[PDB]
Amino acid sequence: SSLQRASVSFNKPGHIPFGAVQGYAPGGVPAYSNKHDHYFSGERNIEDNIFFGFKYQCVEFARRWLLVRKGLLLPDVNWACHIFQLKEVRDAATTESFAVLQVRNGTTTKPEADALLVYPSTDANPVGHVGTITEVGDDYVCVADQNYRFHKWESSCAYKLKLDHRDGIWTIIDDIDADEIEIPLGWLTFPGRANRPEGAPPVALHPSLHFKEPPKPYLLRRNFLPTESKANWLDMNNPAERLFVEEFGVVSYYESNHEFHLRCVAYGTQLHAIFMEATAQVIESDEKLRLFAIPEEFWPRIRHSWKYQQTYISGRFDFAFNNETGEVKCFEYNADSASTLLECGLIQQKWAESVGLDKQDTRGSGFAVERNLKMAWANSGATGRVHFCVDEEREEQYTALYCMQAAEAVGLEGKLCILFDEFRFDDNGHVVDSDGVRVRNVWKTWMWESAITDYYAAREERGENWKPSPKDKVRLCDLLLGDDWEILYFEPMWKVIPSNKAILPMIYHNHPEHPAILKAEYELTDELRKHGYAKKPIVNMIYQQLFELKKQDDYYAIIGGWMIGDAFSGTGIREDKSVITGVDSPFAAVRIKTDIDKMAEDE
Numbered sequence: 001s002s003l004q005r006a007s008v009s010f011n012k013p014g015h016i017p018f019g020a021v022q023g024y025a026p027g028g029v030p031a032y033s034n035k036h037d038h039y040f041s042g043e044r045n046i047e048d049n050i051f052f053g054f055k056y057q058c059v060e061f062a063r064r065w066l067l068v069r070k071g072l073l074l075p076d077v078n079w080a081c082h083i084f085q086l087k088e089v090r091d092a093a094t095t096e097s098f099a100v101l102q103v104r105n106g107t108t109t110k111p112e113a114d115a116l117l118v119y120p121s122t123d124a125n126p127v128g129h130v131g132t133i134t135e136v137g138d139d140y141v142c143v144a145d146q147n148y149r150f151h152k153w154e155s156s157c158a159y160k161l162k163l164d165h166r167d168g169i170w171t172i173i174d175d176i177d178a179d180e181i182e183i184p185l186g187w188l189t190f191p192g193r194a195n196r197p198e199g200a201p202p203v204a205l206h207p208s209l210h211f212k213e214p215p216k217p218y219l220l221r222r223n224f225l226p227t228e229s230k231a232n233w234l235d236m237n238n239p240a241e242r243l244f245v246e247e248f249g250v251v252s253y254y255e256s257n258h259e260f261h262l263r264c265v266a267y268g269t270q271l272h273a274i275f276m277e278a279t280a281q282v283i284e285s286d287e288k289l290r291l292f293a294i295p296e297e298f299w300p301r302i303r304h305s306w307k308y309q310q311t312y313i314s315g316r317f318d319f320a321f322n323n324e325t326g327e328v329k330c331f332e333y334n335a336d337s338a339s340t341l342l343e344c345g346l347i348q349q350k351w352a353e354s355v356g357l358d359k360q361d362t363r364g365s366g367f368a369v370e371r372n373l374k375m376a377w378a379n380s381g382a383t384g385r386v387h388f389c390v391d392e393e394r395e396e397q398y399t400a401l402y403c404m405q406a407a408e409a410v411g412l413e414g415k416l417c418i419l420f421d422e423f424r425f426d427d428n429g430h431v432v433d434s435d436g437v438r439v440r441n442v443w444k445t446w447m448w449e450s451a452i453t454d455y456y457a458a459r460e461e462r463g464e465n466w467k468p469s470p471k472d473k474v475r476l477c478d479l480l481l482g483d484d485w486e487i488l489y490f491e492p493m494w495k496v497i498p499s500n501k502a503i504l505p506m507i508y509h510n511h512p513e514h515p516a517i518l519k520a521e522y523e524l525t526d527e528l529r530k531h532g533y534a535k536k537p538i539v540n541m542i543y544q545q546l547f548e549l550k551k552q553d554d555y556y557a558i559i560g561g562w563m564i565g566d567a568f569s570g571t572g573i574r575e576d577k578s579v580i581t582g583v584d585s586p587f588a589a590v591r592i593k594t595d596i597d598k599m600a601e602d603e
């Protein structure tokens with residue numbers, strides 16, 4: 001019991017883990033959990049060179065289901081909804097094309113089982129959706145799919161939809177969520193092909209239907225000569241974009257193929273899982289917590305943080321990438337607070353528009369950022385007012401205002417706080433703001449170390465019998481390390497752990513397979529002496545292996561990879577001919593070369 005405000009996590013109640021079997025469609029076709037809406041793993045489902053789809057999206061089910069159930073291969077389709085515009089599929093054995101029949105919703109045709117129901121594209125759901133209709137009642141249809149609902153099925157389908165019948169017309173309506181009604185376009189039948197017998201084994205596919213090995217990934221430094229350029233290209237009204245300009249006063253950017261971007265989504269999301277696992281191990285060990293130099297006095301608190309709050313908004317990986325070898329290696333996870341968010345999720349596209357580089361065939365590397373900040377916030381567990389707290393530093397202010405825009409977009413109320421005078425103590429020692437409201441949610445750039453130092457400093461300046469009264473000005477340590485441990489902090493206190501170089505030998509030991517992990521040890525080893533090592537200490541030592549930074553046009557380049565909530569949501573670059581300090585280094589635009597040009601990340 002004990003915990004007055006609810007613990008929060010991104011594992012929502014109802015939902016089952018990514019990849020757990022939710023249930024089976026008739027014929028023994030399993031539906032896997034995609035964790036939650038709009039989650040994207042970056043990982044392909046391939047058995048025996050048959051590319052089914054992405055782990056686990058809605059089309060992936062459609063396609064898997066069609067093979068097992070009818071012996072027919074659904075062709076490549078970028079957006080679910082485009083399925084309704086298919087005229088033909090293909091035969092698993094002969095490859096001969098095979099005529100689907102398109103049957104529109106809201107006509108005089110009743111729907112029937114073993115059809116692919118297809119929802120349209122909307123301003124509110126841009127790729128649409130595809131399910132299988134497994135049964136058709138008098139007044140409903142049953143649907144089997146992936147990536148719409150996340151529960152353990154209580155039957156052979158995911159859900160039931162209304163089937164309306166008035167004046168001769170049949171209309172499947174999805175009004176389950178009464179404030180997000182959708183009407184499907186219609187459904188594809190496959191007239192002439194019987195279901196495969198139930199408990200028949202799967203057909204083997206003609207090898208000319210094997211997945212074409214994708215192109216090897218590349219990230220390549222390009223030079224462009226803009227024909228059209230815009231004098232003022234940022235929106236000076238928007239406060240975020242203003243503080244940027246007053247901070248920073250034939251061109252260049254990087255081009256990645258779609259495969260490189262997929263490789264980052266997959267490596268990103270997996271590294272995040274790996275760091276989180278590691279972070280649990282540290283949290284449960286007195287020894288490891290002393291190693292990370294967390295003072296013993298803060299263990300109850302950090303441990304509490306870890307139990308109480310399993311949500312978080314941002315963290316940034318630092319990668320190197322080598323074009324010839326294909327290798328992506330991760331140096332570190334700056335999960336407490338990273339610069340570069342506004343640049344990545346806005347300024348670089350804005351810029352690209354200014355030099356006319358947003359042609360049809362490429363996209364802004366951080367297109368997802370905006371939409372995923374909203375989803376982090378919407379699912380963060382924060383409710384009521386959120387205080388965004390920063391220093392007299394513009395870089396932090398535009399970082400903050402950018403997450404406020406996202407916060408305010410999803411129903412949260414926001415208040416930017418520069419330093420600590422917006423706050424006061426009330427009659428009972430609690431921290432409150434200028435309108436008299438008790439603090440409950442705090443997003444901040446202020447670092448936990450800075451707080452821990454201010455706490456130790458504070459400890460004499462007033463003493464140890466001291467108890468806050470309205471007389472006392474609020475300090476950092478009161479705003480982040482006061483007696484109210486149930487304030488949600490964004491980036492929570494446990495985020496110091498995965499940010500700490502001491503986690504690096506632990507993630508190496510737990511998962512040395514991972515193509516992105518670098519060998520790291522607590523002690524020098526003969527093998528590190530051969531490969532080359534860096535001796536990186538902490539807040540004794542850790543030793544990590546070296547990776548070559550390869551140059552293009554003489555520039556070294558480090559890649560930043562954002563986690564926004566649990567989404568890997570984009571990449572940016574900083575480059576330098578000498579040393580990428582990224583306090584003072586030029587940021588570089590990353591563009592992805594790809595309705596024939598749209599992706600799966602949008603689902």
Ligand SMILES: [Br-]
Binds near residue numbers: 005006
């Ligand atoms: Br609450």
Ligand SMILES: [Br-]
Binds near residue numbers: 339
């Ligand atoms: Br940084």
Ligand SMILES: [Cl-]
Binds near residue numbers: 058059060600
């Ligand atoms: Cl897919």
Ligand SMILES: [Cl-]
């Ligand atoms: Cl009605």
Ligand SMILES: [Cl-]
Binds near residue numbers: 200201
């Ligand atoms: Cl058979």
Ligand SMILES: [Cl-]
Binds near residue numbers: 299300303
């Ligand atoms: Cl403890």
Ligand SMILES: [Cl-]
Binds near residue numbers: 383384385437
């Ligand atoms: Cl409130």
